[PDB]
Structure 1
Amino acid sequence: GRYPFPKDVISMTGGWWANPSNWKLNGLFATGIAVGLALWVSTATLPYTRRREGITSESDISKWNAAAGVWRERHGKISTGEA
């Protein structure tokens, strides 16, 4: 099927069977912009990455549990379970 279409109208996604003559030439530009944007976003978000485990010491979380017990001693706050 290759029915005729009006060439009046301009859409940004192309129109009906959009195939410009210099699609090689524009394809080199799209290639460059895509690899440059992917490379640049790749290196820009590098220090915002971290691992899930192994960030903080276990000393930290042991003493934070201890200080949470401190903050729970001073308010007399009882367990979930004892009623």
Structure 2
Amino acid sequence: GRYPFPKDVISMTGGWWANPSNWKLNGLFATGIAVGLALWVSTATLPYTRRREGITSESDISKWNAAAGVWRERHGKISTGEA
């Protein structure tokens, strides 16, 4: 279409047809940030990740159920289906 547009206002998105001249140059910076962002984050998030299945033993969780029974018998609790 290419209708005339008032070039006075400065928008954060650039405006109507932002085609600035050093786009070959400034893209060397932002992508240099972008890659430089991502690998910097991915290492930092690395010790915060974990494998879901198989983090502890079944023996630990079964002893936790044993501790549940020891707790619940001391409180004297009926089952969910007992009436």
TM-score bucket of the superposed structures, by smaller chain: over 0.9
Cα deviation, residue 31, structure 1: 1.1
Figure out how many residues of one structure are paired with residues of the other and give that number.
Answer: 83
TM-score normalised to structure 1 length = 0.98
- Structure 1 stretches of 5 or more lacking a match? none
Task: Tell me what 1:3 maps to.
Answer: 3
Cα deviation, residue 44, structure 1: 0.4
Report percent identity of matched pairs.
100
CA distance in 1, matches of 2:57, 2:14: 56
- Structure 2 stretches of 5 or more lacking a match? none
SS at match of 2:37: helix
**Is the helix fraction higher in 1 or 2?**
2
CA distance in 2, matches of 1:56, 1:13: 50
**RMSD between aligned residues:** 0.5
CA distance in 1, matches of 2:39, 2:68: 44
